[PDB]
Design a protein around this ligand. Structure first.
Ligand SMILES: [Mn+2]
Ligand SMILES: [Mn+2]
Ligand SMILES: [Mn+2]
Ligand SMILES: [Mn+2]
Lengths: 397, 396
């Protein structure tokens, strides 16, 4: 009963704005983030940290703008309000989004914003910069015109803050996930013979927007039939036929925090091969989840999924039929962030880490099945953000 | 009569799929871009170039994927097919979009892709790498772990290719602009008392899709009244008689961007609105009249500012006036070199494409932004779209 048979206007009747709205991040929590960054800076022997516009700037300062060709950055040192380097003409706009007190250092269009970063270093006798790994390489070129000391990669400091989510972060993420899960549910409901992949993408966007996501669908992949064999798809619109699997991978943000959920379900009657692979995928996902608790190396969670596949005669390693990519990724303010659930990653799981659990099986020439739900690590184990699917024709628990 | 009076029904009658479709970029032109990069690399003493996923990888290879945490890159050396560094699991999906013959070098999830880059360098005896300045700093870290030699910034090489558009690229951008102009005109026509900023966003997207844009609207800003003085925090507004409307939108066609702003009055304008609107047009016109081969980009920005100063606004970036640059290059990116900004000595040359948008802000009152792009010709410039005629005639 979850697949097909829902009219567009029936689905529409389940799309009122979401009424269980998590609290934004508070001022105190931004100070705690700065404080934690300072601990990790000192641990690494760094005395200044430069964070570019994008997910990390939003994390530390609230500023949500996307990166551009104009340097917008926070420069954190071991004391005092961090410096916010920003185009002069954007000052009014910056003041309206900041969640953290800052010392603003503004540059007019022809002025060199990298000189301002280094001047603010020199003012506090800081000579050991770490730079945001997400920032454009052009920024290392700019800083090099003025800085002669070693520039360290800030990834350890940034991850060491962001990997473990606070309760407020978890609730924002949960909201986003509950919204997208509903959207997934309605998309499965309106599916019918002949529906276009593009029509389902457009519905999903409309539906996330109606529920009050920040900005509709963050992304959306919809594939039918043989196209499901490509983990990230191929160009081209498809039209649905009985007997095909349907893989829908989509998500939204709520105050920048992501959902990221995949469902793969049959439309019509499945073959034995489809059933067999779908069950195996549910089982691989379930084994990865059972492996999660504090102290467990991230690679062990990936190993747990591959062990199920290999005991069914798939794999080993990335061999196809099997799992050609890692089991999962971290999620937060970015879709993909630390920690990664991947072979070779010894990083121990800690309470509050969030990650995907999406051990997709690909059968070359045929189809793929990806079941994707995220979890967070609790004090004694893990918790699903969204409950896994139940069957090939029952995508929703 | 450009503004208002049109039904949604009438607008839809002008929304058949675009029939004058510009040719996609062909296999030979990708090879010419690779060749062009190679001479630039030789001119600058560089023997290896790494391009990351994004507009530059698309330019060189046709791969359109946005950058992610996994290295997807093209490594170009002084000879042989370029090397495409890619996750192994994405190989099938990479093959469906590649437009250039490459030597694929695939890595499994636990393997170090930066190692592959350096091994490909070492096989060619390349030791003088330039790195895409748009790529994440993480890639510098990854490469530096394997290299003792300098990692140069590739921006001279990449801009030396991308800034001057081929005829094929100009035609694709022309298509994108012609479609977006129509959308702008329809949006003006359907505007009425009460209409939502959100309803206009939605219609704009629908229209861009109906005409055959790559993916609807690329972006859409719609501002009414006092909000036009705040060019950068969204919020839904409803239209009233006496308000300015500013609509900034664009699409892509084979990834080539349009980016057009129109600002017009709904109802009767005040004398201040009229005077600033006229000034905006004049500033835009003076910038365009400055464009010709060998003019410095900053001379084009100064030409706009001179208009505003002669009329008593400014000076410099002071308001009421022009608080930021006059315009930006445009291509596969909305914003790319060359920038029409004070301090930029870069001389314009034939084929360069940029925006001309010397917005006037009157603080706390309103703003008027007129935005049309141009390309540089052998003797002067050519508008992709013709400028507005009047505060109540947004379309020439
Ligand atoms: Mn995922
Ligand atoms: Mn996903
Ligand atoms: Mn624009
Ligand atoms: Mn523009």
């Amino acid at each position: 009963t979850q697949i097909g048979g829902m009219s567009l206007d029936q689905a529409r009747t389940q799309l009122a704005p979401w009424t269980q709205r998590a609290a934004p991040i508070g001022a105190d929590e931004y100070q705690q983030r700065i404080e934690r960054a300072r601990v990790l800076m000192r641990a690494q022997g760094v005395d200044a940290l430069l964070i570019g516009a994008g997910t990390s700037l939003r994390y530390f300062s609230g500023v949500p703008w996307g990166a551009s060709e104009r340097l917008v950055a926070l420069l954190l040192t071991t004391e005092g309000d961090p410096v916010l380097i920003c185009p002069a003409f954007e000052e009014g706009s910056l003041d309206a989004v900041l969640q953290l007190p800052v010392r603003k250092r503004l540059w007019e269009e022809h002025e060199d914003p990298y000189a301002l970063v280094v001047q603010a270093m020199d003012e506090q006798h800081a000579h050991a910069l770490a730079l945001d790994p997400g920032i454009a390489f052009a920024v290392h070129t700019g800083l090099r015109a003025h800085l002669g000391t070693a520039i360290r990669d800030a990834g350890a400091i940034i991850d060491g803050c962001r990997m473990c989510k606070s309760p407020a972060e978890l609730a924002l993420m949960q909201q986003a996930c509950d919204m997208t899960l509903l959207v997934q549910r309605l998309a499965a409901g309106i599916a019918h013979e002949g529906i276009g992949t593009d029509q389902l993408v457009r519905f999903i966007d409309e539906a996330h927007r109606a529920l009050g996501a920040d900005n509709g669908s963050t992304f959306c992949i919809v594939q039918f039939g043989h196209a499901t064999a490509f983990p990230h798809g191929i160009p081209g619109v498809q039209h649905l036929r009985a007997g095909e699997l349907v893989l829908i991978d989509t998500g939204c943000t709520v105050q920048g925090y992501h959902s990221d959920i995949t469902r793969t379900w049959i439309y019509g009657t499945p073959s034995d091969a489809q059933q067999r692979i779908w069950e195996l995928e549910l089982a691989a996902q379930a084994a990865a989840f059972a492996a999660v608790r504090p102290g467990v190396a991230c690679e062990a969670v990936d190993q747990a999924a591959r062990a199920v596949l290999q005991a069914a005669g798939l794999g080993p390693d990335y061999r196809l039929p099997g799992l050609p990519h890692r089991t999962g990724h971290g999620c937060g303010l970015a879709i993909h962030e630390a920690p990664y659930l991947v072979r070779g990653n010894r990083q121990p799981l800690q309470p509050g880490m969030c990650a995907s659990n999406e051990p997709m099986i690909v059968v070359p020439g045929a189809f793929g099945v990806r079941l994707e739900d995220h979890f967070y690590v609790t004090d004694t184990g893990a918790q699903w953000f969204t409950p896994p699917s139940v069957a090939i024709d029952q995508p929703f628990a």
